[PDB]
Design a binder for this molecule. Structure first.
Ligand SMILES: CN1CN([C@@H]2O[C@H](COP(=O)(O)OP(=O)(O)OP(=O)(O)O)[C@@H](O)[C@H]2O)c2nc(N)[nH]c(=O)c21
Ligand SMILES: [Mg+2]
Lengths: 731, 482, 737
RNA sequence: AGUAGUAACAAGAGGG
RNA sequence: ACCUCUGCUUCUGC
């Protein structure tokens, strides 16, 4: 219509003030005058409301209330007055007016409410159809992470959501820029259809659409699954000392499932490699494990994920594999050659040390895709040459960039224009270098170079542009055609130690190639296995192992005294082994068992805390070693923690005052001057003594002799009198 | 700045700066530190807005009477249960007041109640009532130009508070506050039905909680505070020109289960044109007690106490007449104080969150819910008190009530003294903790820290007690160490 | 004879694990009564005392006495000192540049981009702001409006572009005016001409007042509010500093609670990994004393010039403005004092301005001494305050300074028998010092402390302490081998928020839920918190369940609604309904939770979009409350709620009706009228602010014309409407003429 | 008087 | 003596 609004305007413009304002206030300046006010933000709203709710007319309502409801109700209550609220034409009304309206006012229809407020109603749906398992009690470290908080988002940026909401709610006010993406367009169609004829305030529609469309996150202490449908009920599923097992109603994302499958498979592989029979152990865990009560076996049967650990599990189960990995949404299959993982430091174009892994060796790569394909060659941080094809030039673009990133070349390293987030958590390096060069090739292409390709009337070229050129191109870039048999899944076999070979006997995958990254599952994994602690996670491997030792201490102690080697070999210590760097397991064991023998040998120097502390490190065939250790390294979420041999550390300490052992900050309960189990082949006697010569490091005790007592900087600022023992202890 | 390049600039000036600029660490050993010094002066006196341990109630079991719920009607029904009235006399003078005026207010109140009709009661603005409620006591406001010449024109008194020292009554009140009564004081609104297992677990724990707390005398005070402050804020807002009477009522249930209405006395609200959130409403409180103030007058400095009747006690081998007193007081509060008093139920949360965290910590290590064990296997497993013999331990039930009482007293006796005392002493607590954890603690100006704590102990009875408590803790820790 | 002592629990329970009991936040916090003039004077005096050994100058433009302690004599004792050294500051900032290659350049480039993009209306965000046009505090937007208006009347209107930087240009150019004209309302309206000097003093003015409701302190303190001339310049300086702080792992700002906790944990972990097993490690739980009073504008000028080295001169000069203005600031001295006569039972107000020449007989000894010291600083009713940073505001930039000192502690820089790292957040810090022996620790602590002094940072020796690494405190976070909970900090947020019925329900359940997740609120206590909240809500809003016999102004109407409802379980609590909440559904909006249980007519009334109660303004401020935590500044709180008839708005304060400023209410009413009708033509302007130089009227006319045409050639409208509109448009067109 | 506590309230402002 | 208005609005920053 537009009938009454223009009449109003006419009316207003009759008035001189209003005409002046309307004629001398630009659209920009309207933003200022819209907020012009004498009213201030209430500094104590709780008090003010308590005060005002005692008053007859504390509520301010549109003046039209006066024609919409009676002045008084059946009971004699005045419902509205003609007093203008300060600064507006709203009037002062009673709360009785709100109730009146709610019993006797104009009934509306609410067909759009579920659709506009879908984000909210969906929460209730997921709960109404959720299932509760039981409550378990235990201590678990809840690590603070950024996590998603709104299920059902469309993964739009704030720009793209704005653009979409403008098209949906206010199409004629869009301006010049209209929607690129097909994701944007298909959302626009749907929403336009769902919300047609909608008479709810477009403010609420836009507000809700914005909340719903944009992925929002938050930093929270979270122990379990990090998916948004789990985050949403964190208050219900997780307490300080408890877990309420629960499954929300509705379907999981395929992305969350895939991600969890990879985490599960890696955990299983990593646990299995440290068992006496890895394949037997992996198969066992494959057959007992579930993700959200789905058997892992079924998932592995029907899930297309190609990943090293996943493929090891598939191999074990007789499932055919595609011996490929994904990178940036494109499937990669190495044709010929191989390379080597190497940890080295890299100065980028930002001017930044960032020391993640490199691939170093000859590797031919066939790369399938959505609408594109290519034949990338790679040496050591080299793009030996990438011939790319596709339906559109566009589809050749995405993959073009992806492949320059993937090369690891110095020309893309020194071409970027940080390595962590704000919480200082390390981020994905060879995926972020892609994200950057995604929305800005500019520098890369004009810092890559060009090439003068021969007439060879077939192999075209792409320039530092996107343009096509005849007998020039980028450094090692081509545009040709070629690329069904890439997707064919092959039958493989797998040996006791998880080596995967094709039917011709060629090595496809080895457990050591499996990424060492300890991720966090988006969905709950239940191993249901005697080989895995009931409580998942590396922190929990630590707390559970020590908790278990302590609670079984009487048995374990007598086993320590009578039958050491059986104790060392117990299966409960194998998960803990996965936290110890592979290269240290044997020497750490050797060191530990020797210290334990010295404790046995030198009577009256028993120490239960020292035994408990070091015991897990005994669980590996020991090697002979000279090396003295002041600490053992554990790797917890990609970061070394050091457990000190002598006394308390941040990782493991005994607190006198509580009389409890605290492990990564969690209590796991509790069970002469001579220390028999700190140095191999020495005793600590007590306080250092100037009347026994100067202070040596540990690594200078080297050349002492039986009976010969020194002063040592033993650790954490202490100096102690040691003595090289007269006899030895053997293992 | 644009061409600046550093070359030993910091190092040079460090080498030119006096060694008196330093942060020398002094080793911290709780065995060799002194107790906090408390202020000296007259003894501290009561400053709650209502009587605590000394309160007396007239009550009606299962009230039925016309208009059950209407405060004044309930009050009359409670009054009607008492037959021991008698001509009022003054037995303990408010030294600084016109004690005659207080007597006359009581008589006026009683008469006006006797004759009231309607649901509310506004008292006549007699001379005695206007005095008690500070009518006209604000100086007439004038332009400076018109009074700049008055000889005694002066800045408002802006000086440190008068100091007062600890007296035994505050500890005694605290003891009583943490004790069980045989009445349930808290009635809770409904929850949605329990569905999740954790909900069922929580409701079992919650019921143990209420069963420790609902009967706790601290919870009686909560209900007194919430009722008084709610009625006084509503009345303050709606009857700004009226001397409105507010009966002091709570309702409880016996352990038998029967409802009971309780009348403790009355409040008379003064005028209440409250603008700023600190602006004062004067009121008079008139509260029943069997306590004879003359035995402990320092507790009752601001009160005029009347003898108003006798109470028959009858073991039916004897029967004895117990004087009934009326504790009468001018007092004041503000919108900010009333608001917080209205919210005193939050004290339940501070206590129970702590208790629950203790149950949960143990549960984690035991890998099971330790609620029933904690509440049922009453070992004395928490130090919560001291006798002449030494440290006494109590059950988790006792802990819940002591922590509740602490929280409730923090609300009743909220002060800047308490704020600063709490924050500064907390550092000293943490230093002691660091010593006991073997973390080799050090200070930079311990003397300064002590002065920072001690200047906060001025005259407030609760702060004086909390300072005393810190010292007892320090001594106990010292005894357990050397 | 057993005496109960709750402190004895600490014999058994580690202090951090029962730390909640040391926080008395169930009682009302302390409030100031009356003037802040005494505290303001205090602060002004202290700030000068700490810098007293510097140089005095008279400002050419304002005549203000200005003390300069920079590059002054070096500290000689442990008292708070302002003798920061330019060369030492520059060394630290250079050290930080070295440690973060490209960081300054990037942060600068982001600021330049922001300068170009930022709209004038950005300044509409903010709280009470000194308004030089009124010589009074006003809301930010009103203060902005007033400055813009007075500017344009005096010939400054580069800001008509709509860009912030053009308003900044206007600000500087305004200082050339011989005679800025404003209008007072005599005690009516009247033209006042300010001298160039008067205007400049007002432009450089901080208003001062006392801080209420602060916890943990016996005594009150003064705070300050700057005006509009400075605010836009502060905006950009702090944006620059923010960009830098975000990339500093030692910055506590601007990350919030959980992320701050993550970053502290990280830094311990980092530190511990980087040390050797033979090193000792100690943590200082650290507080700076007299932070605001000892930081110096001149030093921040140096920091800004250094950080922006190599950048375009226009940008450098732009950023330098805020520091320069702060160097030349003055404080309003507050409301003055009240006096009283016992003999004559009277009382009177004197002004802070009166203090320049009032007879001193009226005052107590303390106050009289204050006034005597202040007099030499007074200029046109204000006190000169060149040193210090009373108003604060450079939170981010002072954090950069602190971090720069932390950054010095790397082993490769120091090459000593000790080294350090830590976290800095304004005037809180945690320092982790490592070395081989205790004497290395002491030396390192002395090195750190003395360096701090050389740049005007003063560690509080009374509030700080040191222990072996493992436990520490940082901004009422307590770490005992990992952060523990402090539930009591949050207790004040448990209650009825006082926004409206709808918002308060969602806020109340969300508070319980977030405390379960973050502050170890146990499930039993959480259930009780639901029950206690519901009760408080029912009493506050008088919305007791429809089957109850409590008498209020609302009870009769709610009972009717009750007796007339079939499905009573569908009634909102605010409509006399039952509480549906338990632990499992705290994250579900009430209206959603009861939707399927509601009588369709009730629902249809409740959710009628046509109702006259709801007050929608803007998408960007929808479902937003402001809450005041126990500690720290006021915060926006998002809540989830369906807009209903319970989403109402309480009435405005009416005290202005009795004042000279009552004309403002009418101006407000007009503007809203104009903005509302505008929104009938451009609905989208409630979502995204419209852009344009066109007048509001020309924009609306063009919209009406085109809308009527499409209406016609879509079928929606008849010709005998399309006539009426296009005609009405032409009348407006002419009436405009 | 009382509240309070470094300065305030114990009604303010306006009209007549 | 009456009449009228006001109850966060000369005072709450970052
Ligand atoms: C850059 N890449 C990527 N890539 C393989 O592709 C896999 C997936 O890449 P990614 O994004 O780093 O994922 P991933 O390593 O699984 O991540 P994470 O282990 O952190 O969970 C790598 O683990 C690696 O095996 C490579 N393989 C070879 N041969 N050469 C290369 O240059 C590269
Ligand atoms: Mg400070």
């Amino acid at each position: 219509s537009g009938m009454e609004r223009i009449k109003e305007l006419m009316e207003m413009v009759k008035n001189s003030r209003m005409r002046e304002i309307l004629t001398t206030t630009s659209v920009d300046h309207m933003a200022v005058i819209k907020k012009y006010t004498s009213g201030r933000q209430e500094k104590n709203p709780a008090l003010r409301m308590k005060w005002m709710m005692a008053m007859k007319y504390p509520i301010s309502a549109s003046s039209r209330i006066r024609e919409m409801i009676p002045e008084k109700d059946e009971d004699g209550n005045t419902l509205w007055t003609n007093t203008k609220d300060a600064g507006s034409n709203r009037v002062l009304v009673s709360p009785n007016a709100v109730t009146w309206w709610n019993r006797a006012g104009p009934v509306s229809d609410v067909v759009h409410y579920p659709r506009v407020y879908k984000m909210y109603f969906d929460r209730l749906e997921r709960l109404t159809h959720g299932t509760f398992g039981p409550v378990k009690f235990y201590n678990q470290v809840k690590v603070r992470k950024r996590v998603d908080i709104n299920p059902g988002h469309k993964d739009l940026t704030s720009r793209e959501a704005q653009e979409v909401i403008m098209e949906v709610v206010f199409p004629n006010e869009v301006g010049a820029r209209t929607l690129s993406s097909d994701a944007q367009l298909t959302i626009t169609k749907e929403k336009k259809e769902e919300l047609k004829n909608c008479k709810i305030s477009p403010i609420m529609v836009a507000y809700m659409l914005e909340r719903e469309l944009v992925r929002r996150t938050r930093f929270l202490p979270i122990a379990g699954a990090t998916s948004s449908t789990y985050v949403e009920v964190l208050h219900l599923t997780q307490g300080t000392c408890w877990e309420q097992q629960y499954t929300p109603g509705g379907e999981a994302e395929n992305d969350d499932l895939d991600q969890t499958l990879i985490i599960a498979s890696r955990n299983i592989v990593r646990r299995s490699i440290v068992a006496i029979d890895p394949l037997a152990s992996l198969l066992s865990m494959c057959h007992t494990t579930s993700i959200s009560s789905e058997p892992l076996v079924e998932i592995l049967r029907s899930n297309p994920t190609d990943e090293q650990a996943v493929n090891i599990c598939k191999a074990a189960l007789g499932i055919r594999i595609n011996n490929s990995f994904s990178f940036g949404g494109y499937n990669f299959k190495r044709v010929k050659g191989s390379s080597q993982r190497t940890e080295k430091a890299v100065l980028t174009g930002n001017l930044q040390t960032l020391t993640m892994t490199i691939f170093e060796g000859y590797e031919e790569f066939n790369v399938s895709g959505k609408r594109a394909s290519a034949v990338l060659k790679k040496g050591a941080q080299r793009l030996i040459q990438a011939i790319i094809g596709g339906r559109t030039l566009e589809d050749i673009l995405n993959l073009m960039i992806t492949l320059m990133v993937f090369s690891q070349e110095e020309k893309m390293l020194k071409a970027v224009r940080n390595f962590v987030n704000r919480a200082n958590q390390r981020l994905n390096p060879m995926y972020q270098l892609l994200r950057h060069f995604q929305k800005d090739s500019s520098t890369l292409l004009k810092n890559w170079g060009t090439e003068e390709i021969d007439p060879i009337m077939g192999i075209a070229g792409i320039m530092p542009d996107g343009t096509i050129n005849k007998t020039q191109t980028l450094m090692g870039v081509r545009l040709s055609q070629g690329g069904y048999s890439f997707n064919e899944r092959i039958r493989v076999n797998i040996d006791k130690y998880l080596r995967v070979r094709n039917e011709k006997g060629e090595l496809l995958i080895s457990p050591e190639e499996v990424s060492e990254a300890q991720g966090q599952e988006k969905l709950p994994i239940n191993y249901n296995s005697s080989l895995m602690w009931e409580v998942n996670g590396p922190e929990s491997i630590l707390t559970n192992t020590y908790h278990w030792i302590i609670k079984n201490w009487e048995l374990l102690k007598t086993q320590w005294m009578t039958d050491p080697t059986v104790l060392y070999n117990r299966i409960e210590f194998e998960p803990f082994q996965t936290l110890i760097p592979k290269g240290n397991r044997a020497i750490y064991s050797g060191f530990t068992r020797t210290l334990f023998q010295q404790m046995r040998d030198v009577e009256g120097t028993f120490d239960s805390i020292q035994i408990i502390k070091l015991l897990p490190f005994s669980a590996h065939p020991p090697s002979l070693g000279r090396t003295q250790f002041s600490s053992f390294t554990l790797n917890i979420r990609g970061a070394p923690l050091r457990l000190l041999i002598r006394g308390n550390s941040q990782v493991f300490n005994y607190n006198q005052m509580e009389n409890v052992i605290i492990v990564l900050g969690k209590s796991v309960g509790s069970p002469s001057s001579i220390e028999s189990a700190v140095l191999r082949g020495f005793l600590i006697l007590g306080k250092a003594n100037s009347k026994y010569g100067p202070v040596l490091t540990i690594g200078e005790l080297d050349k002492l002799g039986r009976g010969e007592k020194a002063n040592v900087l033993i650790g954490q600022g202490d100096t102690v009198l040691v003595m090289k023992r007269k006899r030895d202890s053997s293992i | 700045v644009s061409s600046f390049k550093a070359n030993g600039n910091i190092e040079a000036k460090l080498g030119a700066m006096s060694e008196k600029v330093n942060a020398q660490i002094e080793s911290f050993d709780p065995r060799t530190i002194r107790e906090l010094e408390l202020p000296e002066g007259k003894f501290c006196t009561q400053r709650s807005k209502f009587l605590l341990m000394d309160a007396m109630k007239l009550s009606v079991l299962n009230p039925a009477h016309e208009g059950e719920g209407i405060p004044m009607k309930d009050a009359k029904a409670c009054l009607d249960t008492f037959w021991g009235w008698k001509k009022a006399t003054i037995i303990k003078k408010h030294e600084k007041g016109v004690n005659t005026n207080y007597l006359m207010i009581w008589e006026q109140l009683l008469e006006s109640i006797k004759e009231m009709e309607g649901k509310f009661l506004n008292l006549k603005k007699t001379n005695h009532l206007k005095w008690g409620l500070g009518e006209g006591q604000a100086p007439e406001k004038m332009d400076f130009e018109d009074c700049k010449e008055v000889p005694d024109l002066f800045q408002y008194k802006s000086e440190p508070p008068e100091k007062r020292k600890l007296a035994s009554w505050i500890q005694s009140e605290f003891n009583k506050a943490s004790e069980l009564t045989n009445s349930n004081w808290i009635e809770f609104d409904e929850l949605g039905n329990d569905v999740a297992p954790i909900e069922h677990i929580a409701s079992r724990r919650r019921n143990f909680f209420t069963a420790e707390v609902s009967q706790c005398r601290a919870s009686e005070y909560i209900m007194k505070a919430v009722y008084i402050n709610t009625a006084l804020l509503n009345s303050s807002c709606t009857a700004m020109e009226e001397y409105q009477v507010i009966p002091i009522i709570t309702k409880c249930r016996d352990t038998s289960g029967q409802r009971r209405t309780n009348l403790y006395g009355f409040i008379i609200k003064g005028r209440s044109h409250l603008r700023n959130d600190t602006d004062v409403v004067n009121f008079i409180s008139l509260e029943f007690s069997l306590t004879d103030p003359r035995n402990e007058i320092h507790k009752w400095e601001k009160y005029c106490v009347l003898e108003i009747g006798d109470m028959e006690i009858r073991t039916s081998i004897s029967t004895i007449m117990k004087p009934v007193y009326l504790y009468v007081r001018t007092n004041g509060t503000s919108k900010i104080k009333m608001k917080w008093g209205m919210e005193m139920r939050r004290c339940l949360l501070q206590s129970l969150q702590q208790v629950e965290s203790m149950i949960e910590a143990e549960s984690a290590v035991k890998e099971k819910d330790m609620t029933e064990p904690f509440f049922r296997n009453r070992e004395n497993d928490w130090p919560i008190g001291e006798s002449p013999q030494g440290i006494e331990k109590g059950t988790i039930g006792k802990v819940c009530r002591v922590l509740l009482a602490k929280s409730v007293f923090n609300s009743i006796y909220a002060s800047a003294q308490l704020e600063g005392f709490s924050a500064e002493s907390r550092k000293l607590l943490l230093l002691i903790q660091a010593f006991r954890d073997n973390l080799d603690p050090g200070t930079f100006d311990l003397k300064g820290l002590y002065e920072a704590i001690e200047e906060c102990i001025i005259n407030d009875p609760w702060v004086l007690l909390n300072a005393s408590w810190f010292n007892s803790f320090l001594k106990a820790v010292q005894l357990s160490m050397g | 004879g057993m005496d109960v002592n709750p402190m004895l629990i600490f014999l058994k329970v580690p202090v951090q694990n029962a730390i909640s009991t040391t926080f008395p936040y169930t009682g009302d916090p302390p409030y100031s009564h009356g003037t802040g003039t005494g505290y303001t004077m205090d602060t002004v005096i202290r700030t000068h005392d700490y810098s007293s050994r510097g140089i005095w100058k008279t400002n050419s433009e304002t005549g203000a006495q200005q003390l300069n302690p920079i590059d002054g004599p070096l500290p000689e004792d442990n008292e708070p000192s302002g003798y920061a050294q330019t060369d030492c500051v520059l060394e630290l900032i250079e050290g930080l540049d070295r440690s973060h290659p490209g960081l300054f350049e990037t942060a600068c480039q982001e600021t330049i981009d922001a300068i170009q993009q930022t709209r004038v209306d950005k300044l509409t965000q903010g709280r009470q702001t000194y308004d030089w046009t009124l010589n009074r505090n006003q809301p930010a937007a009103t203060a902005l409006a007033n400055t813009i208006e007075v500017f344009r009347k005096n010939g400054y209107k580069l800001n008509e572009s709509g860009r912030l930087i053009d308003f900044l240009k206007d600000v500087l150019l305004s200082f050339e005016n011989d005679s800025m004209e404003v209008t007072t309302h005599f005690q009516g309206k009247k033209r006042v001409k300010l001298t160039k000097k008067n205007y400049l003093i007002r432009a450089l003015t901080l208003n001062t007042m006392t801080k209420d409701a602060e916890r943990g302190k016996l005594k009150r303190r003064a705070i300050a509010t700057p005006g509009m001339q400075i605010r836009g310049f502060v905006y950009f300086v702090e944006l620059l500093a923010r960009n830098i702080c975000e990339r500093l792992e030692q910055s506590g700002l601007p990350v919030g609670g959980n992320e701050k906790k993550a970053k502290l944990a990280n830094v311990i972990k980092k530190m511990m990994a980087k040390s050797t097993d033979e090193e000792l490690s100690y943590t200082i739980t650290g507080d700076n004393t007299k932070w605001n009073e000892n930081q110096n504008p001149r030093i921040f000028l140096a920091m800004v010039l250094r950080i922006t080295a190599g950048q375009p001169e226009w940008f450098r000069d732009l950023l330098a403005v805020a520091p320069i203005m702060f160097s030349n600031k003055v404080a309003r001295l507050g409301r003055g004092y009240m006096f009283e006569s016992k003999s004559m039972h009277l009382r009177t107000q004197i002004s802070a301005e009166n203090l320049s020449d009032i007879n001193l007989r009226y005052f107590n000894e303390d106050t009289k001494k204050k006034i005597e010291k202040i007099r030499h600083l007074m200029v046109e009713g204000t006190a000169s305050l060149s040193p210090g940073m009373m108003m604060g505001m450079f939170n981010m930039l002072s954090t950069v300074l602190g971090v720069s000192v932390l950054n010095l502690g790397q082993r490769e820089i120091l090459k000593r028998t000790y080294w350090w790292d830590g976290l800095q957040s304004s005037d809180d810090f945690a320092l982790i010092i490592n070395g081989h022996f205790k004497e290395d620790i002491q030396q390192g602590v002395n090195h750190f402390y003395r360096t701090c002094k050389l740049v005007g940072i003063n560690m509080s020796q009374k509030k700080s302490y040191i222990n072996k690494t493992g436990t520490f405190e940082f901004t009422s976070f307590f770490y005992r081998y990992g952060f523990v909970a402090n539930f009591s900090m949050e207790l004040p947020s448990f209650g009825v928020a006082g926004n409206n019925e709808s918002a308060d329900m969602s806020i109340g359940t969300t508070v319980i839920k977030t405390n379960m997740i973050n502050n170890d609120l146990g499930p039993a206590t959480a259930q009780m918190a639901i029950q206690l909240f519901i009760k408080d809500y029912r009493y506050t809003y008088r919305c007791h369940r429809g089957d109850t016999n409590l008498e209020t102004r609302r009870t009769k109407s709610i009972k009717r609604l009750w007796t007339e409802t079939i499905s009573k379980a569908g009634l909102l609590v605010a409509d006399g309904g039952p509480n549906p909440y338990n632990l499992r559904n705290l994250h579900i909006p009430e209206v959603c939770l009861k939707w399927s249980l509601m009588d369709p007519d009730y629902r249809g009334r409740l959710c009628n979009p046509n109702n006259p109660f709801v007050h929608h303004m803007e998408v960007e401020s929808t479902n937003l409350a402001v809450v005041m935590p126990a500690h720290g500044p006021a915060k926006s709180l998002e809540y989830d709620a369906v807009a209903t008839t319970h989403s109402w708005t309480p009435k405005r304060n009416r005290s202005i009706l009795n004042t000279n400023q009552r004309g403002i209410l009418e101006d407000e009413r007009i503007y809203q009228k104009c903005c509302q009708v505008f929104e009938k033509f451009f609905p989208s302007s409630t979502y995204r602010r419209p852009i344009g130089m066109a007048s509001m009227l020309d924009a609306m006319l063009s919209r009406a014309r085109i809308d009527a045409r499409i209406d016609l050639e879509s079928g929606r409208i008849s010709s005998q409407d399309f006539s009426e509109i296009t005609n009405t448009c032409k009348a407006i067109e002419a009436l405009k003429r």
